[PDB]
Amino acid sequence: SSTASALGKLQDVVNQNAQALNTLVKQLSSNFGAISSVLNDILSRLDPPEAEVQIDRLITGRLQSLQTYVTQQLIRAAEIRASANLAATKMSECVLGQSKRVDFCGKGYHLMSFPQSAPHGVVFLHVTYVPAHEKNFTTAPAICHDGKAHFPREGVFVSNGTDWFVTQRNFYEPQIITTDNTFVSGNCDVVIGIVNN
């Protein structure tokens, strides 16, 4: 509400269209090499033999101007179509479901999104989850016990200095190490980083 100029894309799209139309209508007042830019005055001054030549000059010049306008319109339409396809894909993926491709909609782990209308477009409100307040711990890749190596089912080993703990990757939540949340694979004489516990 307070800060303005946050909707530059729609505004300058409108401005581009208006500018193109305005210069097209302005182009009507040029001689293009003939004796005048007003049709009737050329008509009601001369006899046909060169009146037709002047008319031909006006006709051809206006023809190239209109052709140029049409070509520019086609280019702009192609660009707008590409943008609309992107918007449709974003609406399909990040509104009707939770997206996994990173940074597709919002910065951070995406949660959900909302659409809002606009004069010639759409506005997406993306809700994202951002961690903060990190802490630095000592880690290890596996645990030696009875000569066997233990790996975490899902998590990571950390220690605040003593006794070691398992935790989930994205949020601090220590838990005592148990045979229920760890699994064994071979003896621990080959892993680089095993710690006795």
Partner: peptide, 17 residues
Amino acid sequence: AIPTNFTISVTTEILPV
């Protein structure tokens, strides 16, 4: 380094159609 807290952010995205 493991985070201990989180924030929820809401951002805009404008697209002409």
